[PDB]
Amino acid sequence: ERIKDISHRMSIGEAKARRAKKEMVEANLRLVISIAKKYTNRGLQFLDLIQ
DNA sequence: TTATGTAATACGTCTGTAACTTGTTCTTATGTCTGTTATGTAGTTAATATAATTGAAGGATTTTAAGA
């Protein structure tokens, strides 16, 4: 019982944290493309820079 | 006739050359270990900033799939 409860608490905490981080990065995607706009035509394509 | 003594001659042979072989001894080239320096990798930085990009151009015909 104890290990099951610990596992459930771990899982819910990690899921919450992952969801929050995913929301944050999905927000800042635009800042990514903005900054990566400035380093094109240097041997790497635009989308590699974005990634 | 026959002993004798010189002489040609053929065969051993003693010694001088040379081949086969090893000791060993010295020299050198190489492989390896170790110490030091340069190279290669990696992590971090906290005013704020939040949908590219650059061209490119008078083509003339066929055949074959999608759309209706």
TrEMBL record:
It is found in: Cytoplasm. A motif (Interaction with polymerase core subunit RpoC) lies at residues 48-51. Interacts transiently with the RNA polymerase catalytic core. Belongs to the sigma-70 factor family. RpoD/SigA subfamily. Sigma factors are initiation factors that promote the attachment of RNA polymerase to specific initiation sites and are then released. This sigma factor is the primary sigma factor during exponential growth. This is RNA polymerase sigma factor RpoD. The lineage of its organism: Bacteria, Pseudomonadati, Pseudomonadota, Gammaproteobacteria, Vibrionales. The chain holds residues 364 to 414 of 621 of the full protein.
